[PDB]
Amino acid sequence: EMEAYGKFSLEGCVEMAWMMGLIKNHNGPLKGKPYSGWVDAKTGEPVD
């Protein structure tokens, strides 16, 4: 992506964000209400 297009796609960003440890998957209750998907690794908060 970088070598060719010169910037990341959202798909790229999500992969980087994943491997760099900035976001991780969650599949349980977040603050009582259930939730599944991307979560900010640092804060338990969810990320879109």
The binding site for other proteins (CB under 8 A) comprises: 9-11, 14-15, 25, 27, 34-38, 48
Residues of the chain with a following break (C to N over 2.5 Å): none
Whose Cβ is closer to other proteins: residue 6's or residue 34's? 34
Whose Cβ is closer to other proteins: residue 37's or residue 44's? 37
Tokens 């964000």, located at residue: 17
Whose Cβ is closer to other proteins: residue 10's or residue 21's? 10
Find the shortest distance in angstroms from Cβ 20 to other proteins.
16
The number of CA neighbours under 13 Å toward the Cβ of 40 is 7
